[model samples]
Target chain A: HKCDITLQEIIKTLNSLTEQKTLCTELTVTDIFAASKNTTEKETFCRAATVLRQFYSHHEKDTRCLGATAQQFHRHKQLIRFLKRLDRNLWGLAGLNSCPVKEANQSTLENFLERLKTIMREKYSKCSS
Target chain B: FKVLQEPTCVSDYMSISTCEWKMNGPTNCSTELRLLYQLVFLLSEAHTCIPENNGGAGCVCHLLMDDVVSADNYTLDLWAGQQLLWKGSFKPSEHVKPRAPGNLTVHDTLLLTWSNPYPPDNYLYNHLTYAVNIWSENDPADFRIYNVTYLEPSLRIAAGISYRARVRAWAQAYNTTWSEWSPSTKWH
Candidate 1:
């Protein structure tokens, strides 16, 4: 919302900025990752979602998925706002990954985000196994 | 009551006894289960009187390990109903072992002042008299013993470098065996 960057570029920039940059120069973002190490909060949740989308792709869920999901639900509005803000930072978006499912549906990630879309049905529906 | 389980406890210089069982009402610890322990280093033996009612619902044991030193360690075996419930070891020097006295504060120009291990009406002290011992930290063989009786259990000993103090008790009328020396309390 604050800027008009694509989700992809935002992910790349954040990753490089947070990972490559030193704490003295990237204190704010570095602190974000450091704090994320202890707990799954807004910056942590958004960055995690970004990391999953970029590296793992939108395949299945794992430990990172669970941590991301827990933060997403427990802090719903904050997560949502962060996602929107993060959307404005990422630039040059590529093929968008599948979205997570609803809470009532208990729609969670399945396998690790390595497998490609096997069955792309309507609404991406799959019952809990 | 029988010991349902053993507890995880350890100490240096002193041994703590823990026995799990059932009990009712408000009770004190010094009355429930009696502790039989010995100092292997000194060939000294003692027992702790634990009262009933101290046992809680579902039952648990909280044995205390007092003053400890690097050389002062204890190995304890818990028993109940003719059964061994638990076993543990304690090293006081590694735990709450106190350093020898620093900055000797001469409160009354007295070189030493030892307090009673227990207060009056204490069910434990009622049946026992204490044998107080003080020894140079460097040499255990060089020590002095005082029969602590009358109204005062404290004593004034010659002060030099730091020294270690410990207490053991004897049941005069009950003919009970002596109690183990308490963890070593240090003084300047």
Candidate 2:
């Protein structure tokens, strides 16, 4: 079983999220967008989290959701804590994005986390329609 | 396995570099010789090359290069089994002689057009300049050389002359050897 959300689709959604100036400051979005392009260092982490979280919310614990969950949680302190904070077992599938940025402003961190939740909630809404 | 001529190398400054030299005697190049190359900066795994006979007592090796830049330098060593034959440093940008232009056509308002060997987005794309050798087909020695400095790969020639022409190119930045002539096209 595979996840229906493609890497391209995830990147596309991330790109759109970056354009939301009110929700994400320009500089914060730029960093995340640049990080998405770097394929060698688990570049797809944030995108993967969004898509997998979306899949989990809509569907019961299936292999597709399980696989996506594992990929999202590959390695990232921020993602692991955030997903665990959400529901412990998100959409009945556990696991989760990075914390490379040191000394980030409070607004940047809050906006990033808020956007991550919006991406998940939006995906949940999109699949339901 | 003794040395006769030292290995001299040149590049297109885009993809490939070639080195050619003569051996002391008739030798099985594939079995008797190998050329080891590695980026001087990275000093990663040393890649090897198997030589091929170049018609006579000469051996030639074509080394595949990727990510070529002005600062890129390679350490090349020619080896005969466990013995070192020759060693040198080669910088492609300093010795570039690009491949000859292709699909030359004389059409429209005397448009003589050709294709650049490198891709449009490559670093060396617009940096190449051209020279055309045009001659009267009736008299083999009657010829003129035209230097083209424009970025476009087309030259405006005189429309009415029945001329035989061929084109070659060089990298402006490297400022090294001129490429060999392309096959001639005769246009009325």
Candidate 3:
């Protein structure tokens, strides 16, 4: 029943990437990972996935976050696709948009991933293990 | 040497994916051959996996797929010495044959329940659908296929006779092939 390991892997990997990679700490994008008091947990997670989808795609053109043996882009792609696929099962909220008001810089990207990792951590507790 | 069976791969959809294949004849599988795999992504290095010989002709390999995701694909090459034997590509997500649901129980009074194969947080934990079969030798014509779509694996049926039931699962949330049937349980 200790099947939460993979989810833990996902959370830890995301945290490591964001925690280690975001050097330009002054960056602050819109805090899209937060939700209203009335928002469902599933809805919040959906919002996180959506926001990260835009956040990662928007920043992919930059050379800021690189990786070893493999490019950091691959990790970003992996996490993004994994979340989007998970969203397919948790489907409900759609069409929510994030504004691009020039704060989508380096720090914002890491912060966005950190928030998403927190959401995944929350999800890990509810696993069948 | 020729391959009698093509390399078929399956992923736990987490960290490990395994592949099994058979050779045309008896051969020194562990010493003479190697399967080289590499992600079809940038900066990804090719890794080698030597299959353990299964009996005489079959070989199996467990590829390390750390941090694998739905979008990842790897190319596989089977080589002998410096000569290439076979090559193919694998996408773990598409060929998922989930671990079998465990601890199946017959609620002698009402419902049937079992554990889903995966722990919570894994997508398959909530995303799997099950199929249960109930049959009896008393009536060869009596057979049923039950589709259990709920997140929890439970089924209810009434007025049953001496029957044997077994369950299997498919990734209904993002559909894939069914797992091999669970060990069968018989009820009166």
In terms of lDDT, which candidate is strongest? 3
- Per-residue lDDT, model 2, residue B44, is 40
* Model 2 agreement with the true structure over A1-129: per-residue lDDT tens digits: 122223222333344334332211212222242343334323334333343343234433333322334433332322322332232212112112232432222334335545554555565566546
Q: Ten residues in a row with the worst lDDT in model 1 chain B?
A: B97-106
The best candidate by DockQ is: 3
Best by TM-score: 3
Q: Model 1 over residues B1-188: C-alpha lDDT tens digits?
A: 44444433322123343334443344333444444443333223454434344335344444553322223335655444355544555443233211111122223434434444443322233445667777878767888887766355556654466677776665453344555566666756
The alpha-carbon deviation from the true structure for residue B132 of candidate 1, after best TM-score superposition, in angstroms, is 1.4
> What overall lDDT goes with each candidate model?
0.37, 0.59, 0.67
Query: Which of the two candidates, 2 or 3, achieves a greater TM-score against the reference?
Result: 3
Instruction: Evaluate model 3: give its TM-score.
Output: 0.58
Report i-RMS for every model.
32.8, 20.8, 9.3
Worst 10 residues of 3 chain A by lDDT: A87-96
Expressed as tens digits, the lDDT of each residue in B2-68 for candidate 2 is 7688888888876789999888878878888899988754124688989999955789999888546
Residue-level lDDT tens digits of model 3 in A1-129? 222333444554464455334332224555655442455554565455555455545554455533443645565455444444443322222223332232232336556666666666666666743
The runs of at least 3 residues in candidate 1 whose Cα sits more than 4 Å from the true structure, single-residue gaps closed, are A1-129, B1-111, B114-119, B123-126, B158-161
